[PDB]
Design a protein around this ligand. Structure first.
Ligand SMILES: C[C@H]1CCC[C@H](C[C@H]2Cc3cc(O)cc(O)c3C(=O)O2)O1
Lengths: 171, 31
């Protein structure tokens, strides 16, 4: 159990090191908002006394980060808690931790390479190789080595869905 | 042999003075 949380900490610390080294500024934005945004989710609502008005817990920091980029801070990131007032299951908890970063003069192609380098580098640094063993159904089931060797496979939503369905979709 | 006289330190146990101390350290898990 200890080892799992040591690994969790190593993951977060690795990401901070990765982004700091790329010239990102670590920032903090509001967890209480007049208007929640940046994701699709049911929000938590709370009453703030001194301002005599309801506030929402953030579901994401996205809109604040973009405003900071408008402000002239070209590279920003935040690793912090978000809150989604939704259901609990194997992969969802109402409060969970995310990293968001925003990079001026980059597009999505750039973020794919950066994602590949960050994730593959993370797995390799922490586990010693690109391949990690995973039991999708727990130890009672079969295990699979998940291969994080870049580059990652790419598929296009609409085209691949067309192939998968065996039918042409609308333009 | 001359008759026994207990040491002035009491005779219970060897003097054991309190010495200066230094909080131990744990290693950086990230290192
Ligand atoms: C910021 C996003 C980007 C996509 C992956 C991940 C999605 C996120 C969704 C999500 C919703 C929710 O209500 C509770 C949760 O624990 C999660 C989660 O861990 O994963 O983080």
């Amino acid at each position: 159990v200890r080892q799992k949380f040591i690994i969790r900490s190593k993951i977060i610390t690795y990401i901070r090191s990765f982004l700091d080294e790329l010239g990102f500024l670590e920032i903090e934005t509001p967890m209480m908002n007049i208007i929640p945004g940046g994701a699709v989710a049911k929000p938590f609502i709370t009453y703030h006394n001194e301002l005599d008005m309801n506030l929402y817990m953030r579901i994401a920091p996205e809109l604040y980060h973009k405003m900071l980029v408008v402000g002239g801070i070209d590279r920003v990131y935040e690793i912090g808690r978000q809150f989604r007032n939704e259901g609990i299951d194997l992969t969802h908890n109402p409060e969970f931790t995310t990293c968001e970063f925003y990079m001026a003069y980059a597009d999505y192609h750039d973020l794919m390479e950066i994602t590949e380098k960050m994730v593959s580098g993370m797995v390799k640094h922490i586990t010693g190789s690109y391949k990690v063993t995973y039991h999708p159904d727990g130890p009672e089931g079969q295990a699979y080595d998940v291969d994080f060797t870049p580059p990652f496979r790419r598929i296009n939503m609409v085209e691949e869905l067309e192939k998968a369905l065996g039918m042409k979709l609308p333009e | 042999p001359m008759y026994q006289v207990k040491p002035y330190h009491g005779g219970g146990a060897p003097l054991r003075v309190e010495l200066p101390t230094c909080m131990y350290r744990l290693p950086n898990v990230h290192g």
